[PDB]
Amino acid sequence: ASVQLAGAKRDALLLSFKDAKLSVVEYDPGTHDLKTLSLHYFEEPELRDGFVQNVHTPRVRVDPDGRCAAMLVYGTRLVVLPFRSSFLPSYIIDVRALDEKLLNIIDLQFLHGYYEPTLLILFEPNQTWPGRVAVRQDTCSIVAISLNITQKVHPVIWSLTSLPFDCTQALAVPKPIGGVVVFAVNSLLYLNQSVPPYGVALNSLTTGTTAFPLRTQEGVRITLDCAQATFISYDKMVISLKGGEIYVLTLITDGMRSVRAFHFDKAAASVLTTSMVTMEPGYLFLGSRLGNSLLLKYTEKL
Amino acid sequence: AEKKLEENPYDLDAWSILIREAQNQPIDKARKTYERLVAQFPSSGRFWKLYIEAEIKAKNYDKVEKLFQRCLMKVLHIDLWKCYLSYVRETKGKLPSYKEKMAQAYDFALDKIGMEIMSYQIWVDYINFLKGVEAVGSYAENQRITAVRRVYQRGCVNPMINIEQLWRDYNKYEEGINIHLAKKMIEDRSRDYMNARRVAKEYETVMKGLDRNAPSVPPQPQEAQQVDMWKKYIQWEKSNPLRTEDQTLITKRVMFAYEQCLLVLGHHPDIWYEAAQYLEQSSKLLAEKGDMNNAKLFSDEAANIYERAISTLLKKNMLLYFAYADYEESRMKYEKVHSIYNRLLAIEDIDPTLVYIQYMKFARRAEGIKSGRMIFKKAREDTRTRHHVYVTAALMEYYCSKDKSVAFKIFELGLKKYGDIPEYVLAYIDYLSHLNEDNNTRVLFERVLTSGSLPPEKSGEIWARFLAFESNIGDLASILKVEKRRFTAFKEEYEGKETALLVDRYKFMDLYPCSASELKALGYKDV
Amino acid sequence: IFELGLKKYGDIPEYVLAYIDYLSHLNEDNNTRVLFERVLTSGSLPPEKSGEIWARFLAFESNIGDLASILKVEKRRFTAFKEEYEGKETALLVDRYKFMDLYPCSASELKALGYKDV
């Protein structure tokens, strides 16, 4: 992740290496190399709570205003890097010692709007498997923790608790609408603090598997399990599915800036991606391990 | 006696005179007296029994059965379940299928009331009945031995009075058919009996203090002292004397403690509320540990105990509706909730001003802003509605939908209609006092205090929030106009009280410029 | 200025309530709720004297927020005040439903439930 620090002339890079090493680097003029700004080693055996086999990767997210940045060390330890030397000393929020007993994190994002770095955190406090949905119907949840940087507390404002059992990645929707879209395998939700939940279903495998109130998206039968996405300035999200199929989801907005309905369109097919980037407006990048990761170009139709 | 029923409708001395003169009149005239009793006291199974014993005296066997279809499920009183078994023993006794019908009757009672402490004779009367059933051969005799043994093994787990005598009869039945194998069958279930015998002695203590016979009376000394003995009996069964992890065995015993308390004090909202909240607690506790099909069984039972409150005993009591409304929002059955709220609105003499607040507080929270304004549309068209829903609705728009103009138009809609209520205006005064425009809030103040929509005599606290506002902002020239004008408007009751009235120009929250002993004699008052 | 006082005088309940109802009226849900969890977790205020802090908390989580947020708190507020609220739950419930003078029971019924007015 990247963040333009206080008075910096460049954009630092928050890299993350295996067994919880953060490294804030920068390009340097003069010597054309890098330049390490800070080294953060978190490979302490008391930060694992005994779990030797690290299965979760350390995930780096930044606050879009550049107030702080949070690494999820080992799945259970939100390491927060406060920003303003251009830095502040870090600290390790325990995840399992919060409210709601988070305990199986799926994704975490910094949400937009706000006055403090609010961090949405999808989790599964009573974990189930697709393949066992008759005794454990739908257990995914959300906590939007609000990081107080100076006082070093964290109110767990806003929680929903009966999201569908198979939710993949969460995604922060930008400022003029706000909120979050939460990709589930067979559905797609739009959640917000002052708005009731609105989420549609994308096949009829949501019948005996979900008690969440799901509408029916007309003319769409797909799934979203490994689907990378980015946002067009406001109300347009480019989902590349599995199978390399690009869909441009339109969040249809009311006059009070609330999401009323969704709108898909089957756009072109392309690379089996592993990432996604909005470049200069009208260019997209599809970073992929398996396939020539290529630069696209979308236009408006007449 | 009827004059005493006018002041106190539940005057138990006045109801007893109707009971004393009930046997001095025939069954056609006494029937109007008992139906005024049992419909007024639906839970008092002692008062149910006296009319059942009256109708069995006049041999109206068809009418006694209709009484059993009316009150037996709703009243778990032990003398009622004795009278139910005494009826089928007498009436059905000459039928050829009596052995099927009567054996069904004892097993139907022991499932619901067999847990009670005086239910020992209910056990024994089915023991002797199965021995009375004639069986010839060897397989039908072993069918008798199997049937008598099953009630023995079930009854010797149940805490009650004479549990030492049932086991004594159990020892003589095992030795009565085979002495050699009696030494093993007694020994195999003896350890669970010693837990059952011990907790039965523990169950004597909290049950010997209770009444178990009082009529259901809403609170008005001894009555609150009885409640404490019920809350002890509830929380002692919550303390789990039979120490186990099986929440189903834990809850149904606490549910049996709940049903006995609802007979005696059914007009108390807390006993209804602490009933189903324990079921809501037991719903999510069984949802964790695998028992999923029984999680919704107690969850619909949680709606059932709430349903019995609003349908049988407490129809005009608002609190158990909203506990039943917010329970169904927590179960996400949002279409059911509107039936619950509109059920309360159909009741004639309530105050829907509170209900329309909460029925607006559901629609914004669960269904969006536009669903909230449809409720507030229904709040304006009800005559019974007072001013508080106009206060809530503008705050529901400002705090949630972040709009100031809709919050302003709703408040101005109420001020045209309800501008003679001082408690309304102060709720709109402190709203506009906090929006940070001195031009906004002062303009409202001179609207209320000049247009004559509010009476001046009831506007003392309107003027008291005025000087709280003209002291934070404004100049000293503006204040001295007002305390000459406010004193002119209240000339009658403030002459001599000026210096005590001055303190409200200088006071903060608890800071007074004099001691409390000095303000006692100046005439100072605190609003 | 308010945060300057809260660092120095964060153990006075009459101070915090005067800063609670200020931030309750500035129209921001997140800020108002962020302050509430600051006061009630950091331990700068004693928990025994914070009864009216919690009482303004449910006045705020009833105007905004969802029912899921309230039922967390009345399990948590009852956990923080376990000693003096056992037996008083239904009388404590009225403060989730009451408006200014609107109570869902009569004054004769609330006398025996254990209801109190702050």
Curated annotation (Swiss-Prot), chain A:
Subcellular location: Nucleus, Nucleoplasm
Highest rank taxon of the organism: Eukaryota
GO CC, alphabetical: mRNA cleavage and polyadenylation specificity factor complex; nucleoplasm; nucleus
PTM annotation: The N-terminus is blocked.
Tissue expression from the record: Widely expressed, with high expression in the retina.
Keywords, in A-Z order: Disease variant, mRNA processing, Nucleus, Phosphoprotein, RNA-binding
Complex and partners: Component of the cleavage and polyadenylation specificity factor (CPSF) complex, composed of CPSF1, CPSF2, CPSF3, CPSF4 and FIP1L1. Found in a complex with CPSF1, FIP1L1 and PAPOLA. Interacts with FIP1L1, TENT2/GLD2 and SRRM1. Interacts with TUT1; the interaction is direct and mediates the recruitment of the CPSF complex on the 3'UTR of selected pre-mRNAs.
Family according to the record: Belongs to the CPSF1 family.
The name this protein goes by in its record: Cleavage and polyadenylation specificity factor subunit 1
Organism ancestry: Eukaryota, Metazoa, Chordata, Craniata, Vertebrata
Gene that this polypeptide is encoded by: CPSF1
UniProtKB/Swiss-Prot annotation, chain C:
Cysteines engaged in disulfide bonds, as pairs: none
Parent-protein start and end of this portion: 432 to 549 of 717
Subunit structure as annotated in this protein's UniProt entry: Homodimer. The CSTF complex is composed of CSTF1 (50 kDa subunit), CSTF2 (64 kDa subunit) and CSTF3 (77 kDa subunit). CSTF3 directly interacts with CSTF1 and CSTF2. Interacts with FIP1L1.
Compartment(s) where it occurs, according to its Swiss-Prot or TrEMBL record: Nucleus
Source taxonomy: Eukaryota, Metazoa, Chordata, Craniata, Vertebrata
Entry protein name: Cleavage stimulation factor subunit 3
Functional description taken from the UniProt entry: One of the multiple factors required for polyadenylation and 3'-end cleavage of mammalian pre-mRNAs.
Ranges of the HAT repeats in the UniProt entry: 27-63
